[PDB]
Design a protein around this ligand. Structure first.
Ligand SMILES: C[C@@H]1NC[C@@H](O)[C@H](O)[C@@H]1O
Ligand SMILES: [Ca+2]
Ligand SMILES: [Ca+2]
Length: 881
């Protein structure tokens, strides 16, 4: 390992079984062992397989996952159709009738028939694969010199202790380049390494024809999921250093005896494929077997040293892109404390400043680490509710695993990909882009059933050229794009618009023309879908505007209103982004249009759902201009519903049915225009005071800050950051670390939900750098996606530095500050785009740039930007005059 004193570690002086697991367990974790798993174990992965290390003395345990072990989908029934219910949808007639009731003046309608997804065996869920047990068979677990750690920098978990005079060590990592999990096990005296290795599958999912067999140095477990026939195969190849290897007496394990060091190569795979409609590779069980055996064989052929080197090089190339120094201590500090002890001191308010900055920076860093472990460029699937890490397993949705550890697209999956670009991991978004592309074919079925949008030739019609694809909140590995069996969580077609922000951002941050074309195709077809099938002139309940028709605001208030701020803000952003994408391509399709002869009356349709006037302006620019997503209510708040009066009330003073009466609703579905969107910004700030008001009510009772789920706090951190109020933002960071982090630094809802880990990383980035807003100088000139240095810097962080953050337009950003003001900015232009740099903590007019002909422009607020041409590859240093 060499010098690891500068590496980032989570570290513990005792095994998981002796680590504090006393925080709220949450749903599905009533079993003490499962609860211990989520609070205390340490995760690693290669985007595809993953482990969670217990670090037990005698019976060591690594809980094992592979990303595609999903029940549900084709083969789970003889009629799997993505959950779509034709009798419910009626080819769009059910929705059309409901929207007509709204347009005619209803405030609410009963959307109870807009459901699908009734068979929980078809929906399925993500499964814990099983565990690897390394049973040392010690007579007692008495040890000294015990440490377990996770080295975030090298992308490995370590265990060491001394037992009866002998030092045992363990090291675990999962290589992306060699697609293999590695366990390096050592004893300090020859002959003293003795253990049994087995890999039991989780006992709670049904199985068909599973066998566990040993041939030579290799243990193989293989079967088919009883729920859907999915083939699975895992293998452990045990390579003794140049000791004894025997078949375990149970015939289901391997026995290493009288050894000193061994390397285990672990691989696993299924025959899953993200390929509609079959979702299989077509391999036979023998083929998957051969494939998996070759993985471990190729790895062994390369050998431990070379595999480990290629892994650390691969991991660290991404992990080391970003450095942050807020004055933290670390594991090699005098008086360094273990991570569980750090957490406890932080929660009790006894942590020193250096210790507070250690936990804060470790949590930040862990969100980046966790992206690398769960979401690689070659992962078949994006990160799910738990990344890739789980201990729970059952056959059916809404079963033994909370929310199926699924792809949840009414905030959670989005939050997973909030830090991915700004924290310099842009390539790791690729599985999300492919996933969303993967929704187009099944979602055209949903679009046709529920909105009457039928794409002909749905198999050969390219993305961008269809009539629309529709998906809702709960999604899976298998194009489960139907609405849920209950509307009040299940129906949410704006999920697609919203996840298309995360996708569009891949181009916004890179300027890559291959991405431009991919994101343009998606936006074009989803915009067409909404303009042609979803939008209508509102009824009297929602005033004068286009709305999206029957809607629910996740996840509170009335069912089936005439649009809402959530859906309008989202559709506005989508049309915004679609227009930007079209412009960048020279508008080849002529879809941008204009606001000429533009009216909500342009959307009039006949009884059969076709536009009355074929020639009327329904262009993207027109539609966008008619949404008017934002209104301020009687309490000075952003309204969540257009019939809103005061906060939580209707115009006539009556409460809004189902509004969460304390004001602490976890979702803030009506503030998406502030974060992640570009609708309410520090520049376009007509509604910033109302946004802040709304935020205060959502987080505070008087002057007392309220707690919430980890993800709800993660959204609040990001939203406060966009306001510029760095002090309040930081109160939320602190609240998250005190109330929503287990001892292993897993974010919790409860239970463990990874969303809030990625929300934390994003929220910190947004404190130090923003790049989403548009500046308008006093001459009227526009600077779109300008680089905003230290926009929400808390007084708690008076000095520090960060390097390697990414701004839209593709600029890498480093900044150092002291006494609350930037002392240096380093701006690397990766694409040659003109720079426009605001310095919120210091004022850009007070700085000069070197490599430079930089002009200062000012807005009516008195805010200044530095503006200068750049060359791709060049870094510009900005310092105070
Ligand atoms: C996964 C679940 N999705 C819906 C949300 O309201 C819950 O709080 C969880 O995040
Ligand atoms: Ca994955
Ligand atoms: Ca944007």
């Amino acid at each position: 390992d060499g010098d690891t004193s500068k590496d980032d570690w989570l570290w513990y002086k005792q095994p998981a079984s002796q680590t504090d697991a006393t925080a709220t367990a949450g749903g599905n974790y009533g079993n003490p062992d499962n609860n211990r798993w989520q609070q205390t174990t340490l995760p690693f992965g290669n985007g595809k397989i993953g482990g969670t290390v217990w670090g037990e003395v005698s019976r060591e345990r690594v809980t094992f996952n592979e990303e595609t072990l999903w029940t549900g989908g084709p083969g789970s029934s003889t009629s799997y159709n993505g959950g779509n219910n034709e009798t419910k949808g009626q080819n769009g007639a059910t929705l059309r009738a409901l929207n007509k009731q709204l347009a005619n003046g209803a405030e609410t309608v009963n959307p109870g028939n807009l459901t699908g997804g009734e068979n929980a065996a078809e929906q399925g869920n993500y499964l814990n694969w099983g565990d690897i047990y390394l049973d040392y068979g010690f007579n007692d677990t008495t040890v000294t010199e015990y440490r377990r750690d996770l080295n975030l920098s090298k992308g490995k978990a370590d265990v060491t202790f001394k037992h009866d005079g002998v030092t045992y060590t363990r090291e675990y990592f999962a290589s992306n380049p060699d697609n293999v999990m590695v366990a390096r096990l050592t004893a300090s005296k020859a002959g003293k390494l003795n253990f049994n290795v087995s890999m039991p599958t989780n006992t709670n999912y049904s199985k068909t024809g599973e066998t566990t067999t040993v041939k030579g140095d290799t243990l193989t477990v293989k079967g088919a999921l009883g729920n859907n026939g999915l083939l699975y195969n895992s293998q452990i190849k045990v390579v003794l250093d140049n000791g004894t290897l025997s078949e375990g007496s149970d015939g289901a394990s391997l026995k290493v005896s009288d050894a000193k060091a061994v390397t285990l190569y672990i691989a696993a795979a299924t025959d899953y494929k993200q390929k509609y409609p079959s979702y299989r590779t077509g391999e036979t069980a023998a083929e998957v077997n051969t494939r998996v055996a070759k993985v471990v064989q190729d790895a062994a052929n390369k050998g431990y040293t070379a595999v480990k080197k290629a892994h650390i090089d691969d991991h660290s190339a991404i992990y080391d892109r970003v450095k942050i120094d807020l004055g933290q201590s670390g594991h090699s500090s005098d008086g360094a404390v273990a991570t569980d002890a750090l957490l406890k001191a932080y929660q009790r308010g006894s942590a020193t400043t250096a210790q507070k900055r250690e936990l804060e920076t470790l949590v930040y860093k862990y969100g980046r680490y966790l992206t690398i472990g769960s979401s690689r460029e070659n992962s078949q699937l994006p990160s799910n509710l738990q990344g890739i890490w789980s201990v729970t397993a059952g056959d059916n949705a809404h079963g033994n695993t909370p929310w199926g550890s699924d792809f949840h697209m009414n905030v959670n999956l989005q939050m997973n990909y909030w830090p991915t670009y700004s924290a310099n991991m842009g390539e790791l978004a690729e599985p999300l882009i492919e996933y969303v592309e993967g929704l187009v074919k099944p979602g055209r079925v949903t679009a046709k059933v529920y909105a009457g949008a039928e794409t002909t030739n749905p198999e050969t019609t390219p993305i961008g050229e269809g009539e629309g694809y529709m998906a809702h909140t709960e999604n899976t590995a298998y194009g489960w794009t139907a609405p849920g069996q209950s509307f009040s969580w299940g129906w949410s077609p704006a999920a697609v618009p919203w996840i298309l922000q995360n996708v569009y951002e891949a181009y916004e941050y890179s300027g890559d023309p291959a991405l431009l074309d991919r994101v343009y195709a998606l936006l074009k077809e989803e915009s067409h879908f909404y303009v042609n099938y979803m939008l209508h002139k509102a009824g009297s309940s929602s005033g004068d505007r286009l709305t999206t028709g029957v809607a629910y605001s996740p996840e509170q208030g009335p069912l089936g209103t005439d649009g809402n701020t959530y859906e309008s803000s989202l559709v506005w952003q989508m049309l915004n982004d679609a227009i930007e994408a079209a412009k960048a391509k020279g508008d080849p399709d002529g879809l941008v249009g204009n606001t000429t002869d533009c009216s909500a009356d342009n959307w009039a349709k006949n009884d059969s759902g076709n536009f009355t006037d074929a020639n009327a302006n329904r262009s993207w620019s027109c539609a966008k201009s008619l949404l008017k997503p934002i209104e301020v209510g009687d309490s000075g708040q952003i309204k969540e519903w257009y019939f809103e009066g005061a906060l939580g009330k209707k115009k006539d003073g009556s409460t809004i049915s189902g509004y969460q009466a304390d004001n602490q609703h976890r979702h803030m579905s009506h503030l998406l225009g502030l974060f992640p969107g570009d609708l309410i910004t520090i520049d376009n700030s007509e509604y910033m005071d109302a946004a802040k008001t709304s935020l205060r009510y959502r987080c505070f009772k008087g002057n007392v800050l309220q707690s919430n789920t980890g993800w709800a706090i993660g959204q609040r951190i990001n939203s406060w950051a966009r306001t510029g109020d760095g002090n309040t933002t930081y109160q939320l960071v602190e609240l998250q670390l005190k109330n929503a982090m287990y001892a292993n630094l897993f974010d919790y809802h409860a239970p463990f939900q990874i969303d809030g880990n990625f929300g934390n990383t994003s929220g910190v980035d947004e404190m130090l750098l923003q790049s989403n807003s548009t500046f308008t100088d006093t001459a009227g000139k526009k600077y779109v996606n300008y680089t905003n240095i230290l926009p929400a810097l808390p007084d708690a962080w008076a000095g520090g530095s960060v390097s390697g953050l990414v701004a839209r337009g593709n600029f890498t950003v480093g900044t150092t500050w002291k006494n609350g003001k930037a002392t240096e900015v380093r701006l690397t232009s990766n694409k040659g785009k003109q720079a426009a740099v605001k310095i919120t903590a210091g004022g850009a007019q007070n700085y000069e740039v070197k490599n430079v002909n930089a002009k200062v422009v000012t807005n009516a607020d008195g805010a200044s930007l530095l503006v200068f041409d750049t060359t791709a590859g060049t870094t510009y240093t900005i310092t105070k005059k």
